[PDB]
Scaffold this active site. Sequence first.
Site, mmCIF file in Angstrom:
data_model
loop_
_atom_site.group_PDB
_atom_site.id
_atom_site.type_symbol
_atom_site.label_atom_id
_atom_site.label_comp_id
_atom_site.label_asym_id
_atom_site.label_seq_id
_atom_site.Cartn_x
_atom_site.Cartn_y
_atom_site.Cartn_z
ATOM 1 C CE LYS A 159 -3.500 -2.262 -0.073
ATOM 2 N NZ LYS A 159 -3.402 -2.381 -1.539
ATOM 3 C CD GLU A 189 -7.648 3.509 -0.528
ATOM 4 O OE1 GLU A 189 -6.479 3.142 -0.249
ATOM 5 O OE2 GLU A 189 -8.214 3.276 -1.604
ATOM 6 C CG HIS A 229 -5.118 -0.444 3.470
ATOM 7 N ND1 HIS A 229 -4.496 0.504 4.282
ATOM 8 C CD2 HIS A 229 -5.232 0.138 2.252
ATOM 9 C CE1 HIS A 229 -4.266 1.620 3.587
ATOM 10 N NE2 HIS A 229 -4.714 1.413 2.353
ATOM 11 C CG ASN A 230 -7.242 -1.251 -0.946
ATOM 12 O OD1 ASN A 230 -6.314 -0.655 -0.340
ATOM 13 N ND2 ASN A 230 -7.156 -1.599 -2.210
ATOM 14 C CB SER A 251 -0.919 0.033 1.234
ATOM 15 O OG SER A 251 -1.742 1.210 1.143
HETATM 16 O O1 LIG Z 1 -3.373 0.908 -0.719
HETATM 17 C C1 LIG Z 1 -3.240 1.454 -1.809
HETATM 18 O O2 LIG Z 1 -2.061 1.843 -2.225
HETATM 19 C C2 LIG Z 1 -4.427 1.705 -2.711
HETATM 20 O O3 LIG Z 1 -5.585 1.337 -1.928
HETATM 21 C C3 LIG Z 1 -4.183 0.817 -3.931
HETATM 22 O O4 LIG Z 1 -4.424 -0.566 -3.624
HETATM 23 C C4 LIG Z 1 -4.948 1.199 -5.230
HETATM 24 O O5 LIG Z 1 -4.816 2.654 -5.515
HETATM 25 C C5 LIG Z 1 -6.415 0.711 -5.278
HETATM 26 O O6 LIG Z 1 -6.739 0.420 -6.674
HETATM 27 C C6 LIG Z 1 -7.459 1.739 -4.742
HETATM 28 O O7 LIG Z 1 -8.698 0.998 -4.622
HETATM 29 P P1 LIG Z 1 -9.773 1.375 -5.822
HETATM 30 O O8 LIG Z 1 -9.076 1.454 -7.143
HETATM 31 O O9 LIG Z 1 -10.784 0.161 -5.791
HETATM 32 O O10 LIG Z 1 -10.447 2.837 -5.469
#
Ligand SMILES: O=C(O)[C@H](O)[C@@H](O)[C@H](O)[C@H](O)COP(=O)(O)O
Lengths: 467, 467
Positions: free
Chosen positions: B182, B189, B185-186, B127
């Site tokens: 992970k 986010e 985490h997303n 990440s």
């Molecule tokens: O942790 C990270 O560095 C981000 O979360 C990475 O995994 C990516 O930018 C994902 O594609 C974002 O999630 P979405 O594309 O589904 O918004």
Amino acid sequence: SKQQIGVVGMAVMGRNLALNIESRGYTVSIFNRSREKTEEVIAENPGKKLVPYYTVKEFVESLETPRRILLMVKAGAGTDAAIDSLKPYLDKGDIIIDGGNTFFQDTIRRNRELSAEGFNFIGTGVSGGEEGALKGPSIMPGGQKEAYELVAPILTKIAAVAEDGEPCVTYIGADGAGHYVKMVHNGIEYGDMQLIAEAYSLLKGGLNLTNEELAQTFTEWNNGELSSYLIDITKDIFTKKDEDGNYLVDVILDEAANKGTGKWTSQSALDLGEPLSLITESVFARYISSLKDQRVAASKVLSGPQAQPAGDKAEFIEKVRRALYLGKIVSYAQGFSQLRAASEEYNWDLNYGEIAKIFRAGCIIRAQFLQKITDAYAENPQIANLLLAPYFKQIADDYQQALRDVVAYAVQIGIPVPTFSAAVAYYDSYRAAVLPANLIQAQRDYFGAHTYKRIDKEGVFHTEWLD
Amino acid sequence: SKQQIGVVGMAVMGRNLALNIESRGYTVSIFNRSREKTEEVIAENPGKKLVPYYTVKEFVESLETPRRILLMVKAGAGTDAAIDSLKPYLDKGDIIIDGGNTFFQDTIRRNRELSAEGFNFIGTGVSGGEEGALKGPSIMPGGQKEAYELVAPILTKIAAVAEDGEPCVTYIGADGAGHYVKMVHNGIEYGDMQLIAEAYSLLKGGLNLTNEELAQTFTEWNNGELSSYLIDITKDIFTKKDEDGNYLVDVILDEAANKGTGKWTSQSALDLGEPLSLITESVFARYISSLKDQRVAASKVLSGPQAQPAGDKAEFIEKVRRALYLGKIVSYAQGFSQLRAASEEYNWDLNYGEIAKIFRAGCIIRAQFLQKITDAYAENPQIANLLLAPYFKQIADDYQQALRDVVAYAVQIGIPVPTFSAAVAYYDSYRAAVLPANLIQAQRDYFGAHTYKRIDKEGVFHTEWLD
Ligand SMILES: O=C(O)[C@H](O)[C@@H](O)[C@H](O)[C@H](O)COP(=O)(O)O
Ligand SMILES: Nc1ncnc2c1ncn2[C@@H]1O[C@H](COP(=O)(O)OP(=O)(O)O)[C@@H](O)[C@H]1OP(=O)(O)O
Ligand SMILES: O=C(O)[C@H](O)[C@@H](O)[C@H](O)[C@H](O)COP(=O)(O)O
């Protein structure tokens, strides 16, 4: 010496469907893996033309050919096992009807396998609870149309019938379409129960209504546009007492169980990109009720707000009534939008008005409300969302202020209203030409270079927000 | 001679990871399916101790045993394809590390299959985006602990470092645990981004703040307890001007895309029985933003309320600030409770405080907030839910009235706030010792004889409600 139809699975729905079929004049063979449940059904139903079997071989041999076998077995492993046990004994051309709440992908696979093996298969939803299974449920069959036509006469004989005389069964579509429609019926049912639960919480917590007053309130609502089987039974529940004189509803443990269909509906919304917030929050409401030990511990340490005057009793009751009805409209609009997204993805060409028509009687969500939906699709079969149909749009015009008032009041006094508040958020997002997702797209381009589109020119763009 | 590690996949993520590793003093072998991308990286990094290979055989032979191969190719069949192409050359004991955005069940399957063949397999989350992969990401590996310890010297040197000097990488757990963390985490986010989007909605639509005032406000919030990378980039976004010089955030199409992890987090909450409402409503908010044509149509038809006065500017901004922080606390409490449920289901013995520590830097949700979560777990590792920790209970005591006020205001004026709404409904349900699920259980027993438990007697009951 042979019977006309066979039923496998003697739990609540299955035994009642067997009695339903027998009540139409058919002779019926029954079988259940727990052989003692078969014995019991026979003992409880003297005088009915049910014949028990205690081995699968004898059950299958007892049937007139081409055989018609209805399975009402536990979803998943259990149904796969029952089918695999029957198979060696069947003849090509035999008809297998899986009436359980089977996950639709299992039905797509089974339809392919059994059809290739030479059987006529139908995966069908059956809805109506114990009473509906016995007297006449809504039946939603999918599979090849030729296979449907072989069983349409019997399914019509046992199905519920609407007030206009139309049977609450119709061909839904290919392969898993019937079980997918049953899954969404159950998701809609979870949402209707949670909406009613929030109305109950609001009337009991905001007005301190007694159980007799709650029964009275639901009885009045049941005489108007909210009339439905679920509201009708709720009015009864509030006056039911146990032998000790206790109101049953207050000693029932508040852990709502679930057997998978609501969960599957929300997992499908997630796969299909449908914002099915109300039914999903209804599933999560069941999940959190099922963390009772955690809630009891937390209730002792987490603080809340003080009491707040609900105001005039009649004014509050009418606002909660309006909030409940508009919440139902939002839930159904979401559910039917998901049926169109699923129809497109799985190539079913679903007939939404016909689906609403078979839910007018039999099923758990039955209510005159389903006629308003049938009529909307009759006027505009391609309508994208029920909120745009005149009838529903005008109810939203009239009732959204009551819904907003109820949600603001509940949030201020601390009564959880997950589905009433999801209804407001969805109404206000679906009608918003512009949402703050422009900022989300900018954030994604900044941290992940995901690129974005613009409102004033063609193309994909990526910016150095830094420099 | 030989390199201690090689990187397969020279697109931006893999090449940047290889460069991070090289910058630490390592000589790194690289390989890509399309030689042109390799040649490119080579040509672009003159002094770099990068060693190109154009055959899988040569690539594998260039590595010191036990081999460490970091695989950064497209998730799905392409990762299995890269795996399948390495196998013939591998020796028992070698280690494949998948740093792709892989669904954890695929990592469980691969870890099992490869182990049978004598190969180790580490599925790891990475990440931090393109910049982070290059300068220091948060790394979340799961698989064989012994394989992880073998490669940990390299991973600890490339990871971001928290304020206490600790590298943001730690052994997460067996098999798919790293990819599961992970994913969460997303999902977290997505929730933080949607909460920030609602704060933006409200400040712009309720107070009519200009983009300059929005940047100022977010800058002031970032000085305090909300300090976080997502708020830092949001204030940058609000002052970024276009080619012409108009604010770029205002010309971006409000259609939020997604790459699966948020959807996956919510589908896993549904499988595990966790009431993950906030992150799930964040996913559904992205879905409804993506139904732009429907929203524009609906905006021409549906009615809404007349805007009400927000009142004092400073007071409203502080209430939104408090709502945003308490909303984050609720979203993380839900997400960490899901980690605990997943740890129990998949047998991972997750260390929640250590997971929070590697999210303190490198990753997208990095923020000072993660130290408060880390502190909570240091004091009580097996706490059931973060809301129970003294620090979070006190914030909820102090800030819930602002959150209630913000939700009530948004609902009255028609600005959708799905996650602030979900935050209040969860807080008020989690702290409720009794919920209206008693009525839901009565209804299920009434129509389906599903049985119920009682709060005053042990046992399982069923009532004949009709008589
Ligand atoms: O942790 C990270 O560095 C981000 O979360 C990475 O995994 C990516 O930018 C994902 O594609 C974002 O999630 P979405 O594309 O589904 O918004
Ligand atoms: N492997 C299997 N083979 C055949 N029938 C099965 C089965 N697994 C479950 N069923 C049937 O599926 C039906 C519903 O099972 P269940 O456990 O879901 O019931 P309930 O939800 O009412 O408690 C029962 O008739 C059950 O048979 P038993 O009464 O023998 O349990
Ligand atoms: O349509 C129906 O007749 C009911 O839905 C029926 O299929 C059954 O009672 C379900 O088990 C209820 O769903 P939950 O058990 O999962 O409450």
